[PDB]
Amino acid sequence: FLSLDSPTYVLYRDRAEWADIDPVPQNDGPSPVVQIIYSEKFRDVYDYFRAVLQRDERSERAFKLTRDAIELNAANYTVWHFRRVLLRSLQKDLQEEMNYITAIIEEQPKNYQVWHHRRVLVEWLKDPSQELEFIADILNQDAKNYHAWQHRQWVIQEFRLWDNELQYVDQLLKEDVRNNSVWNQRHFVISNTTGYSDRAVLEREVQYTLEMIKLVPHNESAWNYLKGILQDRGLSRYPNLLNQLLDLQPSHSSPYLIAFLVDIYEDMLENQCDNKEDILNKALELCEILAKEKDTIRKEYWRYIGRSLQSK
Amino acid sequence: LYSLRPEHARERLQDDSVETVTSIEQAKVEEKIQEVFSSYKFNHLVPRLVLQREKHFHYLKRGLRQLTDAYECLDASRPWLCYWILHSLELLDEPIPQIVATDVCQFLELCQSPDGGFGGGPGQYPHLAPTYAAVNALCIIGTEEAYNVINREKLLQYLYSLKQPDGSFLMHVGGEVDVRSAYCAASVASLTNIITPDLFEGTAEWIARCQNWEGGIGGVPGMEAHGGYTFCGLAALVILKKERSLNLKSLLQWVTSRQMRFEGGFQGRCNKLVDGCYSFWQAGLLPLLHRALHAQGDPALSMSHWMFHQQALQEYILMCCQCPAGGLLDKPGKSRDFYHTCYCLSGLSIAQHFGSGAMLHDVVMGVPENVLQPTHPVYNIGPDKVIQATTHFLQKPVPGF
Ligand SMILES: Cn1cncc1C[C@H](NCc1ccc(C#N)cc1)C(=O)N1CCC(C#N)=C(c2cccc3ccccc23)C1
Numbered sequence: 001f002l003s004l005d006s007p008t009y010v011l012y013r014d015r016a017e018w019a020d021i022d023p024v025p026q027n028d029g030p031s032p033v034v035q036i037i038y039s040e041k042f043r044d045v046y047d048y049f050r051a052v053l054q055r056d057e058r059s060e061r062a063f064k065l066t067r068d069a070i071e072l073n074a075a076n077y078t079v080w081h082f083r084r085v086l087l088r089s090l091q092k093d094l095q096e097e098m099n100y101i102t103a104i105i106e107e108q109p110k111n112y113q114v115w116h117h118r119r120v121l122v123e124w125l126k127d128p129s130q131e132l133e134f135i136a137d138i139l140n141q142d143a144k145n146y147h148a149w150q151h152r153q154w155v156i157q158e159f160r161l162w163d164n165e166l167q168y169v170d171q172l173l174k175e176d177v178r179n180n181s182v183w184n185q186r187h188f189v190i191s192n193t194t195g196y197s198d199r200a201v202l203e204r205e206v207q208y209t210l211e212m213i214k215l216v217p218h219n220e221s222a223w224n225y226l227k228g229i230l231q232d233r234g235l236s237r238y239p240n241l242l243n244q245l246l247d248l249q250p251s252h253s254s255p256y257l258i259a260f261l262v263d264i265y266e267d268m269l270e271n272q273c274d275n276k277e278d279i280l281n282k283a284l285e286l287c288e289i290l291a292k293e294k295d296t297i298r299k300e301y302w303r304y305i306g307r308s309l310q311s312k
Numbered sequence: 313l314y315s316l317r318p319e320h321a322r323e324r325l326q327d328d329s330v331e332t333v334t335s336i337e338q339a340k341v342e343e344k345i346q347e348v349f350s351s352y353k354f355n356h357l358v359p360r361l362v363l364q365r366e367k368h369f370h371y372l373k374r375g376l377r378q379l380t381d382a383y384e385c386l387d388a389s390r391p392w393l394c395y396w397i398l399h400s401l402e403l404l405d406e407p408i409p410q411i412v413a414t415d416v417c418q419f420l421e422l423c424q425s426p427d428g429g430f431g432g433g434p435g436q437y438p439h440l441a442p443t444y445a446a447v448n449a450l451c452i453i454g455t456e457e458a459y460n461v462i463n464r465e466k467l468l469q470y471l472y473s474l475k476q477p478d479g480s481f482l483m484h485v486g487g488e489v490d491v492r493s494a495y496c497a498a499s500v501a502s503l504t505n506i507i508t509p510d511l512f513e514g515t516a517e518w519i520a521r522c523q524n525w526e527g528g529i530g531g532v533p534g535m536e537a538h539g540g541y542t543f544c545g546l547a548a549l550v551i552l553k554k555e556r557s558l559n560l561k562s563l564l565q566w567v568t569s570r571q572m573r574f575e576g577g578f579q580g581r582c583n584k585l586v587d588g589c590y591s592f593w594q595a596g597l598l599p600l601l602h603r604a605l606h607a608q609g610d611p612a613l614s615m616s617h618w619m620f621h622q623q624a625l626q627e628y629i630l631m632c633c634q635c636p637a638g639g640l641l642d643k644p645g646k647s648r649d650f651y652h653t654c655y656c657l658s659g660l661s662i663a664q665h666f667g668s669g670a671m672l673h674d675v676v677m678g679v680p681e682n683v684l685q686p687t688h689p690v691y692n693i694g695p696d697k698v699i700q701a702t703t704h705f706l707q708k709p710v711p712g713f
């Protein structure tokens with residue numbers, strides 16, 4: 001009704017329609033700790049919030065005030081709660097509220113309360129029709145907002161809106177092949193629609209991923225993906241694997257190729273294989289290269305894999 | 313210094329000439345960090361890593377008393393401000409005046425809800441994040457008074473009020489669900505001894521569903537592995553004595569991959585940037601994973617170090633995450649706050665102190681005055697406060713009903 005930013009904004013205490021109420025001040029106790037020095041404006045709106053809430057005044061003016069209280073501190077979950085109560089009680093137009101939360105999230109896309117509030121509205125309305133488009137707009141400003149991806153998976157799961165998400169994932173992977181949120185989304189999607197058991201799908205995936213690897217060899221996500229989709233069946237159940245990867249040794253090498261090989265070898269050992277003695281030698285040498293030369297930040301881990309590779 | 317060495321410069325980012333928004337940003341942090349590293353060479357002084365403990369103490373000491381309106385945004389996280397400050401002081405081995413501790417106790421009592429749990433400030437609805445914080449604070453103080461602020465019979469009611477059929481908990485009534493709720497509940501319930509037989513029924517199973525294809529744990533099943541959530545999940549399982557509900561092998565490969573070869577500090581997600589608070593959320597996962605693995609009798613485990621570069625993480629923090637005026641931070645350029653102060657310090661301490669039964673290989677970088685008091689890898693409060701609290705509440709019966 002009256003912006004907190006308007007040049008002609010007036011304190012609630014100075015308001016004619018807010019004189020019947022007495023502003024309830026914060027009680028931090030006679031001897032405060034981590035005490036915030038609020039602005040006259042922040043203190044004003046909240047002294048009034050404490051009161052309306054304390055009265056449980058479920059009024060339209062109370063409604064318009066949570067709006068200001070939310071703008072002063074969007075992370076105030078108590079105000080967000082009372083606002084949902086007013087939404088039900090005052091029987092407010094929720095679509096109109098969808099627009100509000102839409103704008104607020106655009107402003108604070110990393111706030112926990114705003115996303116949750118939006119999810120509550122969509123549930124109340126049983127309407128997921130604006131979701132994928134809104135999310136995509138947020139992910140357009142920050143392709144890795146955790147809240148955005150999480151909210152997205154909920155809309156897709158709950159409302160079973162799976163059909164065009166893999167096409168979306170592919171789009172974003174074209175924009176930033178290093179976007180781990182998208183690699184994860186691709187897994188979320190495939191594993192919930194077709195699964196990776198389907199030979200054609202598995203092949204299509206490994207192919208595509210071997211591509212992104214033999215394109216940006218030092219991009220870790222593609223590596224953790226390829227490993228992720230195969231390691232759940234045994235890397236050693238894939239003979240050609242060790243080869244193709246061994247082929248990339250001088251053309252597309254990173255400590256990821258070495259680490260993947262150390263992972264295959266591990267499985268060709270769990271499953272027992274002829275030449276196992278040499279295999280173990282090759283694998284331990286790789287563990288020392290990674291540990292001593294190739295990837296020393298985790299020398300504690302790499303030598304530990306050398307020692308475990310001993311016992312098992 | 314591991315970092316100022318000449319071969320370490322090969323740990324620089326391999327762009328593959330295929331530059332994306334991610335390469336670009338990573339490369340940007342790397343240059344700002346390189347500068348810090350080379351800080352010495354250019355100026356002609358000998359490198360001397362030192363923890364501006366007094367400057368940090370004066371910062372913390374002030375914030376425990378009052379904050380500017382710049383903190384209006386954490387007006388619903390006050391028990392957190394107590395915990396972050398009262399824990400940084402705790403690690404800096406600084407004093408907690410018998411009068412200030414009381415005020416804190418008195419204030420938290422005002423934050424506590426008649427329905428159990430704690431709000432973000434006087435009069436706010438209880439929420440598990442502030443509850444976790446309030447309880448940790450009260451334990452850091454650790455006196456009949458502090459402990460006595462906590463209403464255990466009401467805390468169980470509250471915990472049960474958030475409990476979900478699938479094993480997860482809400483963060484608050486009408487609030488969201490994600491792993492933080494599981495760790496928060498587990499941490500406060502265990503410390504105060506209110507864990508009934510069915511309290512966490514199915515909780516270990518939900519938390520295990522959060523572990524994805526990366527080896528890491530996400531906010532909710534299906535989500536990307538994230539360091540703050542992986543700490544919540546693992547630590548929650550350690551409490552419930554169910555670490556084994558996870559694939560610890562892959563979790564280990566995942567966490568260890570999160571340390572930045574060039575920067576030394578940790579990242580919260582694969583292909584994201586380094587951030588000082590993750591010095592604890594991510595690095596804290598190795599001590600947790602030591603116990604876990606040794607628990608299943610693992611032989612290949614070290615008797616002196618954690619499965620991460622303790623040296624590099626201490627250099628990153630000391631060199632790159634310290635604010636001259638006091639307080640620690642995300643990375644160079646970023647502003648200082650009590651959250652990063654509390655977590656860069658907690659991580660330094662993890663990096664400086666090892667344990668493994670009766671083994672004790674501390675590693676203190678730079679001036680030996682840089683060593684911090686120890687912190688428990690599950691509660692993130694002094695291991696002594698933990699032990700002292702649990703046992704004190706242990707002489708109380710679990711609120712049976
Ligand atoms: C940009 N940035 C870098 N590191 C952290 C952030 C932003 C944000 N932190 C919020 C915050 C800022 C200052 C203080 C102080 N003093 C306290 C909190 C962030 O990335 N998150 C998002 C998700 C999240 C979660 N979950 C956070 C969090 C974790 C643990 C305890 C909290 C208590 C209160 C508020 C946020 C948190 C922090």
Ligand SMILES: CC(C)CCC[C@@H](C)CCCC(C)C[C@@H](O)P(=O)(O)O
Pocket residue numbers: 110146147441444492495496538539540541544580593
């Ligand atoms: C006990 C706890 C409250 C732990 C919280 C741990 C965290 C730091 C969680 C971070 C939550 C998320 C999803 C943050 C993301 O916005 P980002 O990775 O960009 O920082």
Ligand SMILES: [Zn+2]
Pocket residue numbers: 587588589590642652
């Ligand atoms: Zn941070």
